[PDB]
Design a protein around this ligand. Structure first.
Ligand code: SF4
Ligand code: SF4
Ligand code: SF4
Ligand code: FCO
Ligand SMILES: [Cl-]
Ligand SMILES: [Fe+2]
Ligand SMILES: [S]
Lengths: 482, 283
């Protein structure tokens, strides 16, 4: 067959506003363009404010991942202010933020992704849908998917109770500020956090990780597509001591089959195909500028195009798990053997092709959720009830700082420059920015644009795999554009 | 409710939102969000959670809208940006035509039973409309008025709102409509809105005047560090004195905390949020 061009706007069961347009020839995607169609401009809204306000304002980029922005912002402010966060505050922050990794991954798999594979009950918002939706599960396994979707609504809510115990509320925590965390954990509230955590652990171990491998085993073809550049970024997250040198996820870049170090000075944001003034193209974030140009010819997105030493990279659970290569979960090892005939001990034992795939990204996210359980358990042993979690630093007249972390969807940094005790510049380079960006000034596609190449579309009237691929990356276009 | 009861159609449009107003709703304890979706409303369009996609999803909404002309509820999350001919928020494409948030609100707004402006962005403009913005971010009521659209609006603000304020306002309205029909019912709802369009059951009481640290405020005993939970939080920036919400009582996230206990109130339900409540960390 020849060409069909398919536009999907809105792409649903993601966060935020995304259009995807693909060119299909002879049953496969041969080109793609992703458009982030909504802009707010946090980087300009922030200018002129008390810098401390940033750790509230920036959360409103994203109600799914506000703890990530909170974290990046307070780390940036800590550095700019010379705030020395007490050890117990570092741990408390990790408990606040770690709980939202659990929430976000569970939300993503069940409430956003699972309907790609599972038919929900016969009422909105589960119908109508494509007449040929390629829903392959047995009646029993489909029902398990629905039952777990419903249970997961309660589990993700409990994860937000965990966040709120020391974070104040969620979405949009009050409990992280420059200098640490605003509420010392009490013995009683640590009991409450642990009790909720146990319920979440049981759900992750018994339902979520097994269902991803089990559904994956019915969609083995989905490990064979969606590779894209096979290139990944991790900037580090969840500091494990006060040195700034040791993190749960360590930084690294992977591209063209090679591991390389991460040097943030090699990040540049291009705008040829983005709705920003041409003169702002190619800037590192320390010199970043955000000048909207919604009528600029040729542009197709409000997402800038970040490149790392010229490379187009992806971010997220796959990126972190590939870069760090942890041991696989016990249940993952078992199900890989039983359901796939794969012998594996560490994440990379999946191999590059299967890891960097549509279904591999879902597997990576489930594995990472399991991995986070151990981290949280460790923090619950390490935390000291009653020990102070904050310092109260004076606002500097002139300073700069950068905070680096990993949001649930991938690498996140915030840069702040303070002048006359106010925000002079604030630049954000976020996770879905790395994934869902348009072409750069040389015409090289963004990570998801490239991962769309080769996606099968055997039925143009039911082109379900286009958005299935996109959903594997857990896009958050609020974050991508800000 | 029951799986087979009457459940009115709802379309949920996101403008310049962060999805936090959707997420806060997912946190409803009672009724649970599962029960809301399966037993209370029929959520026919919602880009974050619905099965279908793209032009097909838009056309589904349009078919339901035609069937239920004058009768569907329209939830707006986020502000509506008017600059650049609406281009700062495109929400879909159908018939090879892009649909801006401006377009969508002009299309569906006139035909809704009522518009629920959920969150401070939708209600009042919020952060997207704050100083330093350049998109012409506009509140729902102002946008509709400017365009001659007379459909009733109810504001359910907060950044985010508590789920109980969202679900509770829906319950208030559906009860009024059950008792009085649509126009009589909406008139009963409007009677219990304050001057900022907020339901006085949830927004009729001031935080500070009901705060457990009020004695400390009156004594002048002020915490100098966030982690001192004995003193009043006023010197640390608490905006409770200027804020109308019931957070002091229902608290947040299953009652496990609230902003004043944990840190400070930032006045997130108020029409001047954020700029009139900033700086957040001093009085
Ligand atoms: S009101 Fe707050 S939580 Fe709701 S969409 Fe706006 S920024 Fe997000
Ligand atoms: S903590 Fe805030 S709301 Fe409570 S008494 Fe002090 S200023 Fe008022
Ligand atoms: S306590 Fe204040 S900032 Fe917190 S939710 Fe209530 S009104 Fe908003
Ligand atoms: N997770 C998350 Fe949000 C995105 N993309 C950020 O950062
Ligand atoms: Cl997060
Ligand atoms: Fe940015
Ligand atoms: S996000």
């Amino acid at each position: 067959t020849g060409r069909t061009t398919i536009a999907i706007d809105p792409v649903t069961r993601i966060e935020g506003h995304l259009k995807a347009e693909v060119v299909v020839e002879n049953g496969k995607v041969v080109d793609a363009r992703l458009s982030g169609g909504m802009y707010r401009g946090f980087e300009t809204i922030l200018r002129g404010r008390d810098p401390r306000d940033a750790s509230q304002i920036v959360q409103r980029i994203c109600g799914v991942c506000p703890t990530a922005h909170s974290t990046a912002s307070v780390l940036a402010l800590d550095e700019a202010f010379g705030a020395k966060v007490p050890n117990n505050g570092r741990i408390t922050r990790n408990l606040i933020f770690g709980a939202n990794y659990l929430q976000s991954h569970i939300l993503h798999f069940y409430h956003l992704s699972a309907q790609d594979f599972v038919q929900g009950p016969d009422t909105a918002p589960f119908v109508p849908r494509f007449p040929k939706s390629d829903l392959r599960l047995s009646k029993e396994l489909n029902k398990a998917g629905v039952d777990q979707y419903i249970e997961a609504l309660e589990v993700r809510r409990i994860c937000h109770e965990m966040v709120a115990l020391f974070g104040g509320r969620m979405p949009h925590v009050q409990g992280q500020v420059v200098g640490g965390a605003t509420e010392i954990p009490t013995k009683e509230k640590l009991v409450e956090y642990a009790a909720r955590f146990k319920k979440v652990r049981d759900f992750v171990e018994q339902k979520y990780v097994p269902v991803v491998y089990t559904i994956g085993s019915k969609y083995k073809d989905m490990f064979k597509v969606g590779q894209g550049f096979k290139a990944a970024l991790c900037v580090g997250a969840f500091p494990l001591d006060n040195s700034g040198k040791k993190h749960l996820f360590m930084p690294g870049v992977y591209a063209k089959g090679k591991d390389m170090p991460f040097d943030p000075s090699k990040i540049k944001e291009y705008v040829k195909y983005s709705w920003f003034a041409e003169e702002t193209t190619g800037l590192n974030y320390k010199e970043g500028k955000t000048i909207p140009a919604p009528d600029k010819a040729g542009a197709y997105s409000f997402v800038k195009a970040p490149r790392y030493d010229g490379l187009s990279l992806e971010v997220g659970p796959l990126a972190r798990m590939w870069v760090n290569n942890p041991e696989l979960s016990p249940v993952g090892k078992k199900l890989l053997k039983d359901l796939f005939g794969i012998s594996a001990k560490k994440f990379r034992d999946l191999g590059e092709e299967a890891a960097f795939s549509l279904m591999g990204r879902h597997v990576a996210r489930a594995e990472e959720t399991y991995y986070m359980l151990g981290a949280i358990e460790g923090w619950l042993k390490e935390i000291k009830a009653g020990e102070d979690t904050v310092v109260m630093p004076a606002v500097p007249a002139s300073a700069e700082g950068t905070g680096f972390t990993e949001a649930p969807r991938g690498s996140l940094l915030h840069y702040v420059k303070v002048k006359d005790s106010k925000i002079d510049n604030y630049q954000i380079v976020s996770a879905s920015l790395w994934n869902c960006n348009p072409r750069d000034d040389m015409g090289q596609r963004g990570a998801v644009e490239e991962a769309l190449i080769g996606i099968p579309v055997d039925d143009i009237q039911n082109p379900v795999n286009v958005a299935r691929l996109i959903r594997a990356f857990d896009p958050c276009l609020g974050c991508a554009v800000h | 409710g029951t799986l087979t009861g009457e459940r009115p159609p709802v379309f949920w449009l996101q403008g310049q939102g962060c999805t936090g107003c959707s997420v806060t709703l997912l946190n409803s304890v009672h009724p649970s969000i599962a029960d809301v979706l399966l037993k209370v409303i029929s959520l026919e369009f919602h880009p974050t959670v619905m099965a279908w996609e793209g032009e097909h999803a838009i056309e589904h909404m349009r078919k339901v809208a035609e069937k239920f002309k004058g009768k569907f509820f329209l939830v707006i999350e986020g502000s509506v940006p008017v600059e650049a001919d609406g281009k700062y928020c495109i929400i879909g494409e159908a018939n090879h035509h892009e649909i801006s948030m401006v377009d969508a609100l002009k299309e569906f707004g006139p035909n809704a039973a009522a518009v629920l402006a959920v969150g401070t962005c939708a209600a009042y403009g919020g952060i997207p409309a704050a100083e330093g913005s350049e998109t012409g971010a506009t509140a729902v009521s102002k946008f509709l008025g400017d365009n001659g659209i007379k459909t009733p609006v109810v504001n359910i603000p907060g950044c985010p709102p508590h789920p109980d304020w969202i679900v509770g306002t829906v319950v208030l309205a559906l009860d009024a409509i059950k008792k009085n029909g649509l126009e009589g019912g909406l008139a009963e709802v409007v009677k219990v809105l304050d001057s900022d369009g907020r339901p006085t059951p949830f927004f009729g009481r001031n935080i500070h005047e009901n705060c457990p640290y009020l004695d400390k405020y009156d004594e002048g005993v002020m915490s100098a560090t966030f982690t001192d939970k004995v003193g009043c939080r006023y010197d640390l920036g608490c905006k409770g004195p200027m804020t109308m919400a019931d957070c002091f009582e229902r608290k947040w996230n299953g009652g496990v905390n609230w902003c004043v206990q944990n840190a400070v109130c930032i006045g997130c339900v108020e029409p001047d949020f954020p700029d009139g409540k900033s700086p957040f960390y001093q009085a």
